[PDB]
Amino acid sequence: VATPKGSSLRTPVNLAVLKLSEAGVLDKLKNKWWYDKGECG
Amino acid sequence: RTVVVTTIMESPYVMYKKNHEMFEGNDKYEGYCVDLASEIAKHIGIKYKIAIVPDGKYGARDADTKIWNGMVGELVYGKAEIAIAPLTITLVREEV
Amino acid sequence: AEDLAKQTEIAYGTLDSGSTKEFFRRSKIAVYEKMWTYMRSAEPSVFTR
After folding, report:
1. Which segments of B1-96 does DSSP mark as H helices, in order?
2. Does A23 touch chain B (CB under 8 A)?
3. Residue B89, strand partner residues
4. What note about domains is in the entry (chain C)?
5. A20, B39 contact by CB (below 8 A)
6. Hey, are the CB atoms on A2 and B87 less than 8 Å from each other?
7. DSSP state of B17
């Protein structure tokens, strides 16, 4: 996730990415959009 | 203030929803990065507007003019506050 | 099950609204995940009432 250089948003966004990663939510989202919805079997 | 999120129409990251023609704002879109934006915004406590990058590009610097295009350019020139997209972390981008 | 998962001529399915269907839906085991991926999208439906 990108922000303009020095933006005050960067720190919080980074911690949010880590929290989502560690809660398993990023994995859940990838499976939702890639595999759960796959059309090839 | 509402945070302007630049992103790109790239499946399955951001896609036009069924019935988008009669929907407005963030409701027009669905996908991995739409869901991710909602999660990030919730954790960080901001409201936001998804905006598809005007030129449809990720972002590169013109070797001649040195001007950045794409989502990278939207951030560099102050047109967006954040990019939530399949945007690769690279050396030349990390410089700007 | 491996035999089933590796071919498409012979269709296969489960009962609706029970523990067998849930088993396949939730399995992380490759063979059973492959079977679920097939069953959930098979047409006509492979599930029975």
Report:
1. 32-44, 70-76, 91-94
2. no
3. none
4. The M4 transmembrane segment mediates tetramerization and is required for cell surface expression.
5. yes
6. yes
7. P
